[PDB]
Structures are given as structure tokens and as C-alpha cells.
Design a protein around this ligand. Structure first.
Ligand SMILES: Cc1cc2nc3c(=O)[nH]c(=O)nc-3n(C[C@H](O)[C@H](O)[C@H](O)COP(=O)(O)OP(=O)(O)OC[C@H]3O[C@@H](n4cnc5c(N)ncnc54)[C@H](O)[C@@H]3O)c2cc1C
Ligand code: HEC
Ligand code: HEC
Ligand code: F3S
Lengths: 268, 541, 137
């Protein structure tokens, strides 16, 4: 049974009940302390769940969601879609199964409680995950002319070329997405802006699949099991490196080994 | 080359037909060896190749240059005519068909117009006295039509009534996505002419389907979708390989061996280095398309089968069929803004059936929704304009440029024949295919009215610079070369696509189709391949 | 080496009428032009000198006055290279620009550049803009 902390209003207590007991955000947003128990030292400070990573959602202005606007947090929790963040994987499943059916008051209470979570900053954090500006594209159309009369992407090792061929239709060559926002901007995106590129790699490996209000939004998978365009670990690492260096956190790096580990369900 | 590469079923050709058949067979516990003469192709590399294709090759419809042609298994290229498919006869231009060799085949660059044939199309001779009847009825192919539609993710006009249209037992898996501006405008314009412009059923995602994205109107279905929002035959190959099917690219089948009962015992294929490998199987299927299936059958002629494999009726390579097209290009008086949505979104289906089919061919008239920006840019640049005039001309010609087509049904003619070329060979020494084509008085009488209808459409749109092709154009649906039927003396395969001569050999191709129909034929080929899969499963289990 | 690309870029901005031109595309086009024609830099200088001496205000006046001048073909070729993205008229011609080629810009607000999404999946339900309103680029 939930205990009502009388030093806070009813909205805060309801939000705490929803976060801790009902929607159990800490069940995958709070790191387990290697005893398979939540670490009370780092509550809602980010954790690894399989191939995905639930980021820091404390009130840290840079490491967490402290700099998120209340409107953006509400919209993300209700629909999973925001100009700076899109829910994918476990977050998409959590939103489309539990959160999308929550009342507006309940999501507002969750936001109110989240704004009071003590901040858990990170070592390499100076700007927020959605505050990485874009760099101009380095793709060359002319340099692709030598790769004509090729039937496969094997000899396409350039990161810009790979991003343009596999990825620049929906997201644009500048990485700013579509005008209507259906294709998210990779610039200013929380997934590409994280210092931990896990969620980026997973996003490439499995795509995105979120059904909100009976409307389905899908990024196709690009891993070995892809139907649209299978990509090797090296190719995914190169595309992720280009995305990070041009549209996202430039202090984050992706190696083929990292993509391989993400493919294997992360650390065991 | 020493290994004999055994399997339960070996399927020659990894296009839509072969890959769908392989996927259905491995799903049911059969060992499958899928051979393709072409190489493995990556969608993104083809996208890059098309993007770096010259704009003149985009303006005119170059659908082969993005796919590099391999010397051991060349496919057709027409901007520089590579002279692979030789065409003769008065209507040679109408059989300059486009094919793509590789895992996924020509469905790599099709428009994904997935059409069901009318019930009368299967009984054309019994209904109108022309052409030939299919060995099976529409009701027999309906479940396989639906299975193909569900696997390929076809979207169709679910809630609408189209008077000539195949009766469906189930709705389309997806509903047709809304028209772009060009299709709405064309529908409204031609409704006043008595023409019913209706949505084309498309293997395209109007919603996220099969783990693939919803169509965002890249308007490049021909020749490559960058995001896989439409169905490509490579999907079935990938799914089959995931389920255990063995795919061998660059495997050019050239020889076939038969026993005393004329059953196929083995096949022999070449690698790009012309090393021979002998595959042995319990069941052999050729799904190599309507040009390469008869070409292989004629090339694999044995002592038991001197005129070609499964050619006891001398009909292999005969009755070659397609939809002879007449193209018109003009500048609409009012903006049409082609490019919203897929390249083919709607067509006039009013003339798909009628009593007139006893006299002249039934036709499909359609509007091309491909974006006209490359065409407009090249034309304005060739006009010698500079500055603001050049920009205004480009904008006006991309807003007003209209491409219209009228395709016709051709009857199966034994003299419309594919043979092995006596003058041209590829890098492996295999003779090139040579097709002699004549559309016939049926198509000519139909075209006398189709040209008038196209001119009426252009007049209703206030068209200027009207350019109608003075010849018949190919529409890339190759059928009839391995015709089906009930009489072994007048057909090659039976109602189950099994050859009359060889109880062991199945031919999962459009070449088995006895009538070309009025609309695109690949969905019927896929349904026939699934039906042949049922027959093979009955044989081997 | 740097004056040649600056001169080519300024002459290209004059000839196309559009100031915002990609520098990398311009460098590639200049290299291709100098491979095709060894005197191309001399012709660029001659065109620039003709523009500065007669004080032509736009490419329209220059093209009108250059009708019989032997330097006119190079002006038209430069405009074609920037608008179509190619210099030669073959099938194997190198494409130096797609989606940034200037001939796709007059209709970008309405017509999709094919392999790049205009916007999300069902945008075409909207009504197109007027033909008489030229997008700025
Ligand atoms: C531009 C274009 C647009 C089209 N649009 C439509 C459309 O909108 N709707 C529609 O219904 N149809 C359309 N089509 C037609 C469609 O592409 C074909 O009907 C379809 O691909 C069926 O071909 P298939 O599966 O029989 O064989 P294909 O896929 O053509 O070829 C199968 C495979 O056989 C292999 N092969 C050939 N010879 C050998 C050999 N000797 N040994 C081994 N392997 C071999 C090839 O390498 C190839 O990969 C279009 C075609 C083109 C060119
Ligand atoms: C495990 C199934 C989760 C539960 C329960 C909750 N979240 Fe989550 N969240 C999870 C993942 C794997 C991700 C990453 C998404 C991506 O595409 O990589 C997220 C994301 C968020 C975010 C966005 C943070 C950012 O991207 O920087 C927020 C604000 C967030 N999650 C909050 C949140 C809340 C409030 C939850 C309780 C209702 C909650 N999450 C549950 C995994 C899981
Ligand atoms: C169109 C079919 C796409 C292609 C090709 C690529 N992406 Fe994508 N991506 C697409 C959608 C529709 C979405 C999100 C759904 C939404 O809620 O609207 C995404 C998502 C991403 C993300 C995550 C964004 C977030 O979680 O905040 C990333 C990092 C991403 N996409 C990257 C990416 C890359 C690197 C691609 C090239 C391989 C690529 N995408 C292709 C649509 C499409
Ligand atoms: S190119 Fe692809 S995105 Fe749609 S318009 Fe054709 S299926």
C-alpha cells in the first residue's frame, strides 16, 4: 500500500505512486546494484535493459530531463513523440500499453513528481541530450560516381555516403527530419545526443515501432535481420559515428564491437 | 564444383515467384535450394546509383542503369541499348522488356501494381472467342490471390465499387492511401469523358506493414524505393533464407538432365568463372521470368528432348505476350503537379471488360504520377533559357507535365516467339534471347480507339506539345512463353504449373499464363507460384 | 588555385542568378570543367571581365548581349552544370549534384525530389502551392 507523504500535495503523491508502484519506471530506469536490486543511490539515474538503455530521468538539467519543458515531458509520456525525443523499444511498449491510456491528470502528476526527483549528474555532461546543434553535412555526390556499377554497399565505407544511401530519405541529409515532424530530427535528438550511444545503435538495429491512438509509426530495422537494408556491425558503427559527429553528441563513439554487444542483448 | 548441392526442391530464379515459392516451401518443412543467375543487390546501393544517374536518365525512364548488369547474367539496358534481348518483327519496340537479374529479380524495380485478373480473363476464349483459356478458373486462384496479397502487403480500394473488378472474398490487407493532387485532378478530368479512374491495387504500405515503413511518397517505386515501403521480391528471399533456404547468387543454370521417364534428375549451372556445378533435387522449379524460363528450356535441350526441355508441343517460347502500350506526353493547361504519392496510383479500368473483347483488345488507360521535375529541368535547360525565365519554365513544366499511357491485351500468337539467338552470346557462351513480336490486328484495332481516347484525354486537359509514340511500347509483363492448358499437345504445363513432359518439373512464371489480361500480371504470377507450391507440397509429402 | 574557385563561384552565382551555391559542388564542377577544357579558367576570367566592363546586372542581359560571342557556350554550360548536376550528356556522365541541383529547387515546395521524402507519409492530401509563386533559393 502506498504511503501518503503529508509534506507534499496530492498531485506529488499520486505521481510518486504512479512512478514507483504502478508504472514502475525505476524497474528499468534505476540501475540495479549488481545484486539485482535497485540502487537507492541512483534513483531514476539510467540503466541498461537488454539491448536498450533507459536514460537518466532525474531533475538534472544536463544529465537528466530537468531541462525538458513540462509540455514536452507530458507529450512524451502520453504519446511518445516530441520534437527532441521519440520513444522506442521498451519505452514505446510502456507508452503504448500503459501510459497512453492514463488520464491527463495522472500524467501531470507523474511530471510533477519527476520534477522533484533529486538530480543525479553524470561525469561527461555539459549540455543536455537534446541541446546538441547540427554540423553541416559532409556528403559528396560527386564522390559517389566512382561507386556506380556496384551492386552492394561493401565498397561504400564512408560514413556520410552510408548515411545518405541508407538513411537520408526519411531523415534528411542535414539530419533535421521532415517538416511535419513524422521523421524526427537527428539534430537535437535525445537518442543521438546521449553520451552513451546504446539507444542510437539499438535504434538502427531494430528501428522504432510505436502505436499510439491506434496509429502506428515505424522506423524499419537495419540489423542483420533487416528486410529493407541489412547492415553489418561495421556499417552500423560508421553510420552511428557520422550521426554522432554531425547531428548529435560528438564525444560519443561507436565501434563495431559495441554494435555486436548491443546485438547480443547487451551485457549479461 | 565437385559437390552435387542436393536439396528437396531447387528453384531456378530468385525473383518474386521463386522467392515466394521458396518461402512457402521452407515454411512447410521442405529443403529448398534457391539459385539466381544475378548477384546479391543492396537497396541502398541501388538508391545511390539512381541518385547519381544522370538527370536525362531520370527524365526518360531508365529503370536498369541503377542495377549494374553482370557479364555472366546480363539483363536489359536501353539507354545505351546493351543488345541482350534481341527484338524483331513489326512491333519489336513493344518487346524491349526490362528485366533485372539478381536476388529479388525484376521486382526490385517494379511499380508494385498488384492486380487480380477478372473472372472472364481466365476464360477469354470461352467468353469472347479469342485467345486461350487458362487451365484453371478465377475461383481456383482466388485463395492464392489473397495469400499473395497478404504476404506482399497489397493496399486496395476496399470500400469502393469498381464495376470491372475481380470479386473478392476478403478485403485488401490495407486500404488504398489517399490520392495525390495529380490523381485527384486526373480522376475529376476524365470522369467527364466517361472514363472511371479508380485506385490501383498496390503492394505498397499505406500503413506500417510487415515491419516495413508506411509509404512516404518517394515517387521512385520505379526503379528503387529507398525505404522499402513497397514490396520487393527480395523480401521473400530474405524470409526464406532466414527459415533455412539456401540461396546461391551468380548461379546461371544452363543444363538439365532427364531420365528414361523424362523426369529431371539434375541441373547444371555456371559460376561467373564458367565452372559447372550439378544440383540434384527431388523437385525442380524454374522461376526465371517469361524470357529466361523459355530461354533455359530451349538451351537445355537433351537427346530425349531435342527441341528443348518440356517442348514436345513445340510451344516453348511461342505465344509470347505483354501489354503493348501507347504513351503520350504533353503539358496540361492546368497544373497537375505529378509526384504526390507513388508513381502509379490510379488507372482507368472502365475498358477492362466488355463484349467488344470479341473484336478488339480490352485496354487500361492510366496517368503516370512520376514527378516531372527532372523532365522539366532538362527540357527547360535544352530550351536555352537563363535567369528567372529558366526557373519559371522549370516550375511550369513540372507543374503541367503529363504522361499518359494506354496498355492493350495481346492474344497468344504462336509466331510471337522467343528463340535462342544465332548471332549473339553472353560471357558464358549462352545465346541471347531473340523475340519476334507482332501485336496483331486485335491490338491494332484496339489501339485505333485507344489513341483517340488518349487524344480526348489530352484535349480535356488542354494539352500542348502532345507527343504520342508512333510505336507500341513494352510494359514489362512477360507471359505466354510456356503456356498452360489441359491438352499436352497444345500446352506446356497443366493447371498446377507442372510440365506435361516432365512430372518432376514445375514452371513458376508468368510464361505459363494463357492470357495477358488488361492489367499488370505479377500478382497473378505470384498466386500461380503459391498454387504450384501447394502442388509441390502435395507431391513431396 | 584559390582565385580560380572564387572566380568560378562568383560567376556561377551571377549566371544561375542564385547566390546560395554549395562550395564543394562548385569545386567539383570547376575541377571537371578544367579537365574537360584546359582554357576554362581563361574563359571564366573573360566572362567576368565582360560582366564587369559592361556592368551587366543579371544573367539575362549578359545572355542577350552574348548571343554571338564564343564565350556564350561556356556560360550556358556552367548554368547547365549547376542546374542539372552534370557536365556531359551521356549515361556514364558524372553527377556532381542531386537534390542540390538548381533545377529541382523551383518546385521543391510542391514536388518531391524522388528518393528524398518531401515530408511524412500522407502529405499529398494537401493542396499544392500556386505555380506563379516561385520559391526563393
Ligand atoms: C519497370 C518495371 C515496372 C513494373 N511494374 C509492375 C507493376 O506495377 N505491376 C506488376 O504486376 N508487374 C510489374 N512489372 C513486372 C514485374 O517486375 C515482373 O512481372 C516480376 O518481376 C515477375 O518476374 P519473375 O519473378 O517471374 O522473374 P524475375 O524476378 O524477372 O527474375 C527471376 C530471377 O531469375 C533469374 N534467372 C534468370 N535466368 C536464370 C538462369 N538461367 N539460372 C538462374 N537464375 C536465372 C534472374 O537472375 C532473376 O533474379 C514491372 C517490371 C518493370 C521492368
Ligand atoms: C522499461 C520497460 C521502462 C519503463 C517501465 C519506463 N521507461 Fe522510460 N525509457 C525506457 C527506455 C528503454 C528509454 C529509451 C528510449 C529510446 O528510444 O532510447 C526510455 C526513455 C524515457 C525518457 C526519454 C529520455 C531521453 O530520451 O533522454 C523519459 C523522460 C522516460 N523514459 C521516462 C519514463 C517515465 C516517467 C516512466 C514511468 C512512467 C518510464 N520512463 C517507464 C525504459 C522504460
Ligand atoms: C524512414 C523509413 C526512415 C529511415 C530510412 C530511417 N529512419 Fe530513423 N526514424 C524514423 C522514424 C519514423 C522514427 C521515429 C518514430 C517517431 O516517433 O516519429 C525514427 C527514429 C530514429 C531515431 C530515434 C529518435 C528518438 O528515439 O528520439 C534515430 C536515432 C534514427 N531514427 C536514426 C536513423 C538512422 C541513423 C537512419 C539511417 C540508417 C535512419 N534512422 C533511417 C524513420 C526513418
Ligand atoms: S519509392 Fe517508396 S516511399 Fe512509396 S512512393 Fe514508392 S513505395
Amino acid at each position: 500500500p502506498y504511503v501518503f507523504d503529508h509534506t507534499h500535495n496530492d498531485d506529488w503523491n499520486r505521481g510518486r505512486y504512479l512512478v514507483d508502484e504502478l508504472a514502475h519506471c525505476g524497474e528499468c530506469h534505476t540501475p540495479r546494484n549488481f545484486l539485482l536490486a535497485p540502487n537507492q543511490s541512483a534513483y531514476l539515474a539510467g540503466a541498461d535493459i537488454g539491448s536498450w538503455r533507459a536514460p537518466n530521468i532525474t531533475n538534472a538539467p544536463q544529465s537528466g530531463i530537468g531541462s525538458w519543458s513540462d509540455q514536452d515531458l507530458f507529450q512524451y509520456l502520453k504519446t511518445g513523440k516530441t520534437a527532441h525525443a521519440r520513444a522506442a523499444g521498451p519505452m514505446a511498449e510502456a507508452i503504448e500499453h500503459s501510459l497512453q491510456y492514463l488520464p491527463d491528470a495522472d500524467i501531470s502528476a507523474i511530471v510533477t513528481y519527476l520534477r522533484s526527483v533529486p538530480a543525479k549528474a553524470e561525469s561527461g555532461q555539459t549540455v543536455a541530450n537534446f541541446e546538441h546543434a547540427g554540423r553541416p553535412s559532409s556528403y559528396s555526390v560527386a564522390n559517389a560516381n566512382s561507386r556506380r556499377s556496384n551492386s552492394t554497399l561493401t565498397k561504400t565505407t564512408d560514413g556520410a555516403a552510408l548515411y545518405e544511401a541508407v538513411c537520408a530519405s526519411c531523415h534528411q541529409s542535414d539530419g533535421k527530419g521532415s517538416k511535419d515532424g513524422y521523421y524526427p530530427s537527428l539534430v537535437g535528438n535525445t537518442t543521438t545526443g546521449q553520451l552513451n550511444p546504446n539507444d542510437l545503435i539499438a535504434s538502427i538495429l531494430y528501428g522504432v515501432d510505436r502505436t499510439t491512438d491506434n496509429h502506428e509509426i515505424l522506423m524499419p530495422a537495419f540489423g542483420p535481420d533487416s528486410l529493407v537494408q541489412p547492415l553489418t556491425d561495421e556499417q552500423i558503427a560508421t553510420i552511428a559515428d557520422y550521426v554522432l559527429s554531425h547531428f548529435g553528441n560528438a564525444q560519443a563513439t561507436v565501434s563495431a564491437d559495441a554494435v555486436k554487444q548491443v546485438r547480443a542483448g547487451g551485457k549479461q | 564444383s565437385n559437390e552435387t548441392l542436393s536439396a528437396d526442391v531447387v528453384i531456378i530464379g530468385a525473383g518474386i515467384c521463386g522467392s515466394l515459392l521458396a518461402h512457402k516451401l521452407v515454411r512447410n518443412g521442405l529443403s529448398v535450394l534457391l539459385l539466381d543467375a544475378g548477384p546479391r543487390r543492396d537497396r541502398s546501393q541501388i538508391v545511390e546509383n539512381w541518385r547519381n544517374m544522370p538527370p536525362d536518365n531520370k527524365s526518360q525512364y531508365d529503370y536498369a542503369t541503377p542495377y549494374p548488369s553482370v557479364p555472366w547474367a546480363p539483363h536489359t539496358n536501353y539507354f545505351p541499348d546493351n543488345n541482350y534481348l534481341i527484338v524483331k518483327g513489326p512491333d519489336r519496340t513493344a518487346y524491349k522488356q526490362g528485366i533485372i537479374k539478381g536476388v529479388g529479380g525484376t521486382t526490385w524495380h517494379w511499380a508494385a501494381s498488384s492486380w487480380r485478373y477478372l473472372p472472364n480473363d481466365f476464360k477469354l476464349h470461352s467468353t469472347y472467342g479469342v485467345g486461350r483459356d487458362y487451365a484453371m478458373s478465377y475461383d481456383e486462384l482466388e485463395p492464392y490471390y489473397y495469400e499473395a496479397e497478404c504476404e506482399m502487403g497489397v493496399m486496395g480500394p476496399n470500400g469502393e465499387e469498381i464495376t470491372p473488378s475481380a470479386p473478392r472474398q476478403n478485403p485488401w490487407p490495407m486500404t488504398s492511401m489517399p490520392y495525390g493532387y495529380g490523381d485527384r485532378t486526373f480522376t475529376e478530368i476524365v470522369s467527364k469523358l466517361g472514363f472511371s479512374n479508380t485506385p490501383v491495387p498496390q503492394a505498397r504500405n499505406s500503413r506500417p506493414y510487415d515491419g516495413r515503413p508506411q509509404c512516404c511518397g518517394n515517387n521512385n517505386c520505379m526503379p528503387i524505393c529507398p525505404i522499402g515501403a513497397m514490396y520487393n521480391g527480395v523480401y521473400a528471399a530474405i524470409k526464406a533464407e532466414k527459415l533455412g533456404a539456401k540461396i546461391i547468387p551468380n548461379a546461371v543454370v544452363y543444363a538439365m538432365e532427364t531420365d528414361a521417364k523424362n523426369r529431371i534428375t539434375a541441373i547444371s549451372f555456371y559460376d561467373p568463372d564458367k565452372q559447372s556445378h550439378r544440383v540434384v533435387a527431388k523437385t525442380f522449379v524454374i522461376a526465371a521470368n517469361g524470357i529466361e524460363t523459355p530461354k533455359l528450356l530451349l538451351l537445355a535441350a537433351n537427346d530425349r528432348n531435342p527441341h528443348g526441355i518440356a517442348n514436345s508441343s513445340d510451344l516453348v517460347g511461342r505465344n509470347m505476350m505483354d501489354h503493348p502500350g501507347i504513351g503520350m506526353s504533353f503539358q496540361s493547361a492546368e497544373p497537375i503537379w505529378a509526384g504526390g504519392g507513388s508513381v502509379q496510383m490510379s488507372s482507368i479500368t472502365n475498358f477492362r471488360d466488355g463484349d467488344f473483347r470479341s473484336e478488339y483488345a480490352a485496354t487500361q488507360i492510366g496517368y503516370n504520377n512520376t514527378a516531372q521535375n527532372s523532365r522539366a529541368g532538362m527540357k527547360a535547360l535544352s530550351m536555352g533559357l537563363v535567369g528567372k525565365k529558366l526557373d519559371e519554365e522549370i516550375r511550369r513544366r513540372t507543374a503541367h507535365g503529363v504522361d499518359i499511357y494506354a496498355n492493350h491485351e495481346v492474344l497468344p500468337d504462336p509466331n510471337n516467339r522467343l528463340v535462342l539467338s544465332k548471332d549473339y552470346k553472353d560471357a558464358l557462351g549462352i545465346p541471347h534471347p531473340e523475340v519476334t513480336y507482332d501485336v496483331g490486328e486485335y491490338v491494332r484495332k484496339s489501339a485505333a480507339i485507344s489513341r483517340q481516347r488518349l487524344m480526348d484525354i489530352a484535349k480535356a486537359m488542354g494539352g500542348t506539345e502532345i507527343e504520342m509514340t508512333p510505336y507500341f511500347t513494352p510494359n514489362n509483363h512477360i507471359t505466354g512463353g510456356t503456356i498452360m492448358g489441359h491438352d499436352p499437345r497444345d500446352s506446356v504445363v497443366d493447371k498446377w504449373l507442372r510440365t506435361h513432359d516432365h512430372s518432376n518439373l514445375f514452371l513458376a512464371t508468368g510464361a505459363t499464363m494463357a492470357a495477358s489480361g488488361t492489367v499488370n500480371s505479377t500478382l497473378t504470377m505470384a498466386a500461380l507460384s503459391l498454387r504450384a507450391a501447394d502442388a509441390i507440397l502435395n507431391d513431396l509429402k | 588555385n584559390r582565385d580560380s574557385i572564387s572566380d568560378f563561384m562568383q560567376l556561377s552565382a551571377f549566371a544561375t542568378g542564385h547566390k546560395n551555391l554549395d562550395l564543394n559542388i562548385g569545386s567539383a564542377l570547376l575541377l571537371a570543367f578544367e579537365a574537360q577544357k584546359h582554357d576554362f579558367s581563361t574563359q571564366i576570367k573573360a566572362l567576368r571581365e565582360h560582366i564587369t566592363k559592361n556592368n551587366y546586372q543579371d544573367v539575362e542581359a549578359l545572355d542577350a548581349a552574348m548571343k554571338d560571342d564564343p564565350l556564350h557556350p561556356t556560360l550556358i554550360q556552367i548554368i547547365r552544370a549547376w542546374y542539372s548536376g552534370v557536365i556531359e550528356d551521356e549515361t556514364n556522365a558524372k553527377v556532381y549534384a542531386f537534390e542540390k541541383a538548381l533545377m529541382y529547387q523551383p518546385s521543391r515546395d510542391v514536388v518531391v525530389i524522388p528518393t528524398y521524402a518531401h515530408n511524412g507519409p500522407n502529405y499529398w492530401v494537401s493542396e499544392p502551392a500556386s505555380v506563379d509563386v516561385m520559391p526563393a533559393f
